[PDB]
Amino acid sequence: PKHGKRYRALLEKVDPNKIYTIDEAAHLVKELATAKFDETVEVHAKLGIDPRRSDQNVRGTVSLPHGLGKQVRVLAIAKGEKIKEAEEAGADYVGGEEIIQKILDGWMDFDAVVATPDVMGAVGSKLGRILGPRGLLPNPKAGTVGFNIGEIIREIKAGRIEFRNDKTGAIHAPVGKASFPPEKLADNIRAFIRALEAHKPEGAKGTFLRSVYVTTTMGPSVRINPHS
RNA sequence: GGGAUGCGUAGGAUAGGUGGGAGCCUGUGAACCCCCGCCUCCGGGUGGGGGGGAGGCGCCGGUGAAAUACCACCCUUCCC
Ligand SMILES: [Cl-]
Ligand SMILES: [Cl-]
Ligand SMILES: [Mg+2]
Ligand SMILES: [Mg+2]
Ligand SMILES: [Mg+2]
Ligand SMILES: [Mg+2]
Ligand SMILES: [Mg+2]
Ligand code: NA
Ligand code: NA
Ligand code: NA
Ligand code: NA
Ligand code: NA
Structure with a gap:
């Protein structure tokens, strides 16, 4: 059969x-x-x-x-005061822009990635090849990029x-x-x-x-x- | 309407797209083997038949732009 x-x-x-x-x-x-x-x-x-x-x-x-009835592990990438905002909003992991590569090495266990627009050049430049073809590359059009990073994270964790x-x-x-x-x-x-x-x-x-x-x-x- | 078809390179090797997926199939017949059609990029793939009578498959890893089961909606091409 x-x-x-x-x-x-x-x-x-x-x-x-x-x-x-x-x-x-x-x-x-x-x-x-x-x-x-x-x-x-x-x-x-x-x-x-x-x-x-x-x-x-x-x-x-x-x-x-x-909601989705499932946990969503969110990685946030941010700069400056926005790191704290991301962390306090409940992201599972928040990395400074400058430590992106270490995410690439093997610290890579997440269901969604969000970022602020001012780190997007680093993100794309160093993460695009990997994240893009996995539907994980932050993009404004997908609602995963913005300065409202705390709100984005909360929305994603709320389904x-x-x-x-x-x-x-x-x-x-x-x-x-x-x-x-x-x-x-x-x-x-x-x-x-x-x-x-x-x-x-x-x-x-x-x-x-x-x-x-x-x-x-x-x-x-x-x-x-x-x-x- | 019916039936097939989906392969650059790397990689087990024949990976159309996207989404779901950490499980799936099996005495309602596993592995293995034999026969035959069709398709073929000539590697194999796919469908049917016979034997057999209990094991295959996926998640991980590796390679890769992408990952294998399973399931869903689609799309390509061909045959009658
Ligand atoms: Cl700042
Ligand atoms: Cl929207
Ligand atoms: Mg597929
Ligand atoms: Mg296929
Ligand atoms: Mg698929
Ligand atoms: Mg169930
Ligand atoms: Mg395969
Ligand atoms: Na789906
Ligand atoms: Na059932
Ligand atoms: Na079953
Ligand atoms: Na089911
Ligand atoms: Na389905």
Whole structure:
């Protein structure tokens, strides 16, 4: 078989040709998470954009009302008085701009990296090759750069997520854990969808949310009506 | 509609993109072996069949721009 028996059993619980309401899907996804850990709940959208047109990029952040249900280890890079701000805001690690390389050596255990704009030259210059292709390079457009570094850090530790369309024109985000109560998943799903809509490019043609699905780390998908 | 296809270099070697991922598969038949189709960058890959009857796979590390399981939405090319 393509898939093992656990997966095949889950597949029987979803009607592949049905478009579910968000409320139904939020209940259903809880039964689609039988792998041996608390699985992540995901939302995917095929977007009505031309992904090869810079002016139709979809990229941003959204604070999920119920968070991600996971720890996010944040590294901050800062200079001057901003180091203390980063540290007092709860970053797991805060390095001065001048010690970047030592981060590279092996002190590199984090889920997210933030910086202030005035260290970004050092950051890019010395960290870009590594961080960039791992989705960890701070960028203003991704909400991971700014002088409000304390606020950024707090938002990330409170379950803000990033989203950015891939170059096929699809987009994806984690939005909670399968062990969440269903109405909390429902809230998080809608929050993400609202954020996507808030980021529909002005020049995008046709239906924006062409398809939207909810799914779990190791389970099948459920197609949803994003407007419910 | 049906079926395939995804390989610069380095790296086990055939790594399309992104997101999830620390677990996954297995008497609902593991390892290994044999037959056959298709695809092929000629390395292999992929799908089916027969034997077999209990072990494979991933996380880490290494290499690399990127990492292998598994799962999700997509995209490329080809065949009929
Ligand atoms: Cl934003
Ligand atoms: Cl300062
Ligand atoms: Mg589970
Ligand atoms: Mg892949
Ligand atoms: Mg692949
Ligand atoms: Mg992937
Ligand atoms: Mg591989
Ligand atoms: Na199973
Ligand atoms: Na199951
Ligand atoms: Na599952
Ligand atoms: Na995802
Ligand atoms: Na998935």
